[PDB]
Write a structure and sequence with these properties.
- The structure is cut from a larger assembly and holds chains A (99 residues), B (151 residues) and C (117 residues).
- With 99 residues, chain A is α+β, with helices and mostly antiparallel strands.
- Helix content of chain A is 43%, strand content 20%.
- Chain A has a 3-stranded mixed sheet with strand order 1-2-3.
- In chain A, strand 2, helix 2 and strand 3 form a beta-alpha-beta unit.
- The radius of gyration of chain A is 13 Å and the shape is globular.
- The N and C termini of chain A lie far apart (33 Å).
- Chain B has 151 residues and is mainly α.
- Chain B is built from 6 helices and 2 strands; from the N terminus they run αααββααα.
- Chain B has one domain.
- The radius of gyration of chain B is 17 Å and the shape is globular.
- By secondary structure, chain C is of the alpha/beta class.
- Helices cover 17% and strands 27% of the residues of chain C.
- Classes of the chains: A alpha+beta (99), B mainly alpha (151), C alpha/beta (117).
- Chains A and B meet through loops of A and loops of B.
- The structure holds magnesium ion (MG) (27 copies).
- One magnesium ion (MG) binds next to loops of chain C.
- Chain C binds one RNA strand of 324 nucleotides through strand 1, strand 2 and strand 3.
- Chain A: This is 30S ribosome-binding factor.
- Chain A: Keywords: Cytoplasm, Ribosome biogenesis, Stress response.
- Chain A: It is found in: Cytoplasm.
RNA sequence: CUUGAGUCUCGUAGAGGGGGGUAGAAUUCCAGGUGUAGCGGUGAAAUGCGUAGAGAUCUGGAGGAAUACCGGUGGCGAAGGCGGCCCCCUGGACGAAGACUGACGCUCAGGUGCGAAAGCGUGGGGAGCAAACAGGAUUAGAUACCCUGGUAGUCCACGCCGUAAACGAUGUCGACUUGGAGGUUGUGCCCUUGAGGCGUGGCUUCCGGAGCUAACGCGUUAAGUCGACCGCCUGGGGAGUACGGCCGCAAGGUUAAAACUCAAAUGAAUUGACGGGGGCCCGCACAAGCGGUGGAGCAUGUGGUUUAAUUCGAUGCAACGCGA
């Protein structure tokens, strides 16, 4: 379907499987997701994660590192959850909400 | 400038006074590679500015220039797929060049039925923190920090 | 109108809205503002900026009750938890603890079918 | 006769099965406290909900269904399947050491039983969910996808149905044939003993050798080397259809053709092509700059129109001060 509708739905699903089904102590901080933008093809998607812990890079760096290392696990969960064709490749990014 | 960010060339110091920044100025208002004409206009304008100032031409020129040097300006950028009108702080040589260009442009558009005369007029004006060049620096700063959202 | 000086803020952070309500420690509510009721609709109805706007609009309606000590309980992993938290933190309030309390069942009821989009 | 197959003894692990209790979250609803104008929903919207007071929040109650965490590249079961906890009844598997029986074995047409989900009959139940349906939208069109509702059904009891990509697309049983890394469950012996070391079984996951295979791959749980029995195949379509029988309340299942038509249909692997991809990385490509063209007059070329003729050719970049 349209990339933005799939973007909204995938934001919902990533937020869900990010709040509940994680066990990495590197993650935490009520990690939210501001949104996710994906290409016209649904093959690739970029998530904009927003952390809470102090914005000091020592921690948000570790958070994005853990997310990128668990991307395979999150992709498997997404593929079983949200019922689409290709299970896009995920790329996490710190959304600098404070500007 | 995609592979190797290229540096800047070294202007040799001004002939009469000895200021490399005055050399950059005379290069900046030089039209059609006519050096001597712009050089004479600048020398005549600086002397006229000095008589009212009662100060050395290099210092009065410096105080007028720093009165025009901006510190922040707008930039059209693309980072998140948006027409980012980001305010960003300027580099020293960049703000020098912008000040010189702005005062040259304001002088050129003033007219005053001469060139050295109008240049000295608006240099003395920018010295007292008034004029279109200063007006345009304040307008740039206003446009920049009217959108503080992206800092 | 009275003085409690120690309340708790429920933040229902839906994927389409954000409902902040400050209540007495025994569940009796005091006031509430919504991201929708703050002059936002459609997408903006569920954006973090509107969430903090709603948080501040709700704080401005309980200040006469005299509180600056809060525990907050968030529900729903919607965008607009971070926002309202930092908002009511920037509203002179002292937050002692923030707690995730989203209702998670132990396989209670069957969820609605996935949207085919 | 005891080596195959069984029996006994002592133990071990297990969502194996049937029955009955019970607990804690959550959804919904009902009644109250607090508390006021929104809630809900979408890519945007409306249908919907609320001034009779919703939503949000706390307390209490009712009811139904399913059992987060543990949870496992785990376990049990012939397969289908099986997931809170507790009791009762009950099936199988495995191990240690013996004792016992003495080929009692393997396979199996017909036959019998079991057999997801949907469906059927009778009665009960009904929170959530949800074919059909009713709306709201979107769209050329929407009888779809999306949204708000929502009946059968999903749940229970007793019968019926007997089909699934019921799959490891791999029949059952037995023997034999190099390795390595795990999981899980027994067990023997030894060390100062927990810890640890050296063994030895069952089940199971993943690499890989010989060998096999069209290749992909399989590889001691074979698709390797052999034996026993059973099922099944014979080009694609017609067609798992017709007819007949048998079965079923029905839906239909099962058994199962031929005429006719076509010269292929197919499996595995190979090289490329097509993206309205991913990027990496370059170029005055953009950016940072300076000067222009687009307006004016004229020069010149072209198109067009005109003319007896306005000779011919060059026509996106790469024709148009071009052949000249
Ligand atoms: Mg939304
Ligand atoms: Mg049991
Ligand atoms: Mg009821
Ligand atoms: Mg004997
Ligand atoms: Mg048979
Ligand atoms: Mg059924
Ligand atoms: Mg019917
Ligand atoms: Mg029935
Ligand atoms: Mg009935
Ligand atoms: Mg519904
Ligand atoms: Mg069959
Ligand atoms: Mg199965
Ligand atoms: Mg088969
Ligand atoms: Mg065998
Ligand atoms: Mg087994
Ligand atoms: Mg192998
Ligand atoms: Mg074999
Ligand atoms: Mg074969
Ligand atoms: Mg044939
Ligand atoms: Mg038939
Ligand atoms: Mg028949
Ligand atoms: Mg220009
Ligand atoms: Mg022109
Ligand atoms: Mg023209
Ligand atoms: Mg012509
Ligand atoms: Mg011609
Ligand atoms: Mg030329």
């Amino acid at each position: 379907g349209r990339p933005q509708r799939v973007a909204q739905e995938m934001q919902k699903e990533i937020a869900l499987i990010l709040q509940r089904e994680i066990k990495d102590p590197r993650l935490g901080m009520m990690t939210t997701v501001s949104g996710v933008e994906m290409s016209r093809d649904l093959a690739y998607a970029k998530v904009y994660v927003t952390f809470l812990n102090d914005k000091d890079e020592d921690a948000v760096k570790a958070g994005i590192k853990a997310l990128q290392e668990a991307s395979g696990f999150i992709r498997s969960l997404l593929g079983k959850a949200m019922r689409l064709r290709i299970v896009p490749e995920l790329t996490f990014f710190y959304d600098n909400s404070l500007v | 400038p995609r592979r190797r960010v290229i540096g800047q060339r070294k202007i040799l110091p001004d002939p009469k006074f000895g200021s490399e920044l005055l050399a950059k100025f005379v290069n900046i208002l030089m039209v059609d590679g006519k050096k001597s004409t712009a050089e004479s206009i600048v020398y005549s304008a600086l002397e006229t500015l000095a008589q009212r100032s009662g100060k050395s031409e290099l210092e009065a020129f410096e105080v007028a220039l720093e009165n025009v040097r901006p510190t922040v300006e707008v930039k059209s950028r693309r980072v998140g797929g948006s027409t980012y009108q980001v305010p960003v702080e300027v580099r020293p040589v960049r703000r020098n060049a912008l000040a010189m260009r702005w005062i040259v442009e304001a002088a050129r558009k003033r007219g005053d039925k001469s060139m050295a005369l109008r240049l000295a007029n608006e240099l003395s004006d920018a010295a007292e923190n008034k004029g279109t060049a200063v007006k345009k620096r304040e307008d740039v700063h206003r446009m920049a920090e009217a959108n503080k959202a992206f800092a | 109108r009275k003085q409690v000086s120690d309340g708790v803020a429920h933040i229902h952070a839906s994927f389409n809205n954000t409902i902040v309500t400050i209540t007495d420690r025994q569940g009796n509510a005091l006031g509430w503002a919504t991201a929708g009721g703050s002059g936002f609709r459609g997408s903006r109805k569920s954006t973090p900026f509107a969430a903090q706007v709603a948080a501040e609009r709700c704080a401005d309606a309980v200040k006469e009750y005299g509180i600056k000590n809060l525990e907050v309980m968030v529900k729903g992993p919607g965008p607009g938890r971070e926002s309202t938290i930092r908002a009511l933190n920037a509203a002179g309030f002292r937050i002692t603890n923030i707690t995730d309390v989203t209702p998670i069942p132990h396989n209670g009821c069957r969820p609605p079918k996935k949207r085919r989009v």
